[PDB]
């Protein structure tokens, strides 16, 4: 070892047991991944099953309350906890587990162990790629789900008034956070989400095209109608005609890939560039630096009572989302709206 | 006589990606820049 032959310490006896080719690879990262990722998944499955949200949010979010898979969640703490980490030994919980669950501290249990779980999983695939002696592109692609997770679950509530405005860990709970960003941030209009859509919805295109272009330009390497049998992964030749694939799309779409390595890196590039841009927009929304208004069309639509665009329709719909949910979306504000002050169209 | 002398290359497909990228960003963002 090390081409100078020192004597093995207890590290080397620990390094080769961790880096063992057993059924599930532990590695050095598994001392960080497997305790944290089991408690994020274990905290989420416990909180959606048993833990209430009646005190942090004033609304039921567990299976034991009556919720199903879509509406149950591990909900965020109240806005009165600000950015408190809500340690169970913290000044709010103070050792009591059954009140730590009622104070929404089991949200930050999942959010912090999920955040250090994502560090443990990304270090896992640096560690495996150095064992297998590959290139580290699987980890670099996973920077973009960590860019999404940190900017939404961690960076966004730190810029707001508390962990309350974080996404809760649920299905319908993500859906209001989605509807919160339309009503309050006009987040469809933000050009970083627009680059985030074009990356996410453009990687789904590249996934479907490259899957279908390969599967329909295959070489006839077998006799039967099952084309999946005519492959051995230790073969040296390509399993599909890249030349036919190029001539097909150069005549259908006009432009095709001619380089197989550039293709698969472009499949790598589009969802990562898309999520890193959309993560920057959520960083901008943490400070409420919205792309809310086009001021040149607000000045015109206020000085001209007949100038209507689909933009000014969207601004009116956001006023509807803001006033009709915030008596119940933000219970810490304790705002009561009489029914005549909320905006309202004709006969609805 | 620096031995570390390299050249940059840019083929036409990378020209067409680069010119497209700075026009699509100008199609996207200038609506916000002109506000």
């Amino acid at each position: 070892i090390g081409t100078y032959q020192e004597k093995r310490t207890w590290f080397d006896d620990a390094d080769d047991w961790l880096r063992q080719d057993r059924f599930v690879f532990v590695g050095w990262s598994g001392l960080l991944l497997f305790p944290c990722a089991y408690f994020a998944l274990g905290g989420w499955l416990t909180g959606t099953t048993f833990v209430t949200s009646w005190y942090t949010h004033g609304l039921a979010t567990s299976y034991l309350e009556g919720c199903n898979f879509l509406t149950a969640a591990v909900s965020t703490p109240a806005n009165s906890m600000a950015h408190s980490l809500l340690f169970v030994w913290g000044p709010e919980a103070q050792g009591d587990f059954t009140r730590w669950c009622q104070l929404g501290g089991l949200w930050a249990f999942v959010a912090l162990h999920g955040a250090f779980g994502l560090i443990g999983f990304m270090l896992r695939q640096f560690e495996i790629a150095r064992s297998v002696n590959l290139r580290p592109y699987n980890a670099i692609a996973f920077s973009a789900p960590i860019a999404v997770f940190v900017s939404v679950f961690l960076i966004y509530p730190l810029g707001q008034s508390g962990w309350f405005f974080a996404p809760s860990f649920g299905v319908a709970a993500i859906f209001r956070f989605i509807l919160f960003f339309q009503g309050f941030h006009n987040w469809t209009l933000n050009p970083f989400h627009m680059m985030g859509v074009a990356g996410v919805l453009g990687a789904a295109l590249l996934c479907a095209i490259h899957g279908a272009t390969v599967e329909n330009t295959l070489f006839e390497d077998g006799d039967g109608a099952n084309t999946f049998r005519a492959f051995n992964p230790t073969q040296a030749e390509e399993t599909y005609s890249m030349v036919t694939a190029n001539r097909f799309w150069s005549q259908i779409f006009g432009v095709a890939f001619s380089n197989k390595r550039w293709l698969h890196f472009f499949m790598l590039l589009v969802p990562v560039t898309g999520l890193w841009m959309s993560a920057i927009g959520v960083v901008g929304l943490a400070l409420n630096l919205r792309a809310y208004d086009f001021v040149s069309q607000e000045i015109r639509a206020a000085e001209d009572p007949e100038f209507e665009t689909f933009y000014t329709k969207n601004i009116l719909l956001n006023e509807g989302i803001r006033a009709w949910m915030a008596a119940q979306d933000q219970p810490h504000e304790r705002l009561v709206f009489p029914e005549e002050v909320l905006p309202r169209g004709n006969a609805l | 006589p620096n031995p570390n002398k390299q050249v940059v290359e840019l083929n036409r497909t990378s020209l067409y990606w680069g010119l497209l990228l700075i026009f699509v960003l100008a199609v996207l963002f200038s609506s916000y820049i002109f506000n």
């Binding site: 150069s250 432009v255 001619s258 | 010119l19 497209l20 026009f23 200038s30 609506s31």
Partner: peptide, 30 residues
């Protein structure tokens, strides 16, 4: 004025589409 700038950015994007199809770097085989 800005609508002149908008159409120049849209014509310019459709120009690159025209050159990327009919003046592409042709894939040489072998």
């Amino acid at each position: 004025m800005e609508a002149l700038v908008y159409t120049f950015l849209l014509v310019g994007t459709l120009g690159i589409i025209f050159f990327s199809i009919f003046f592409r770097d042709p894939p040489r085989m072998i």
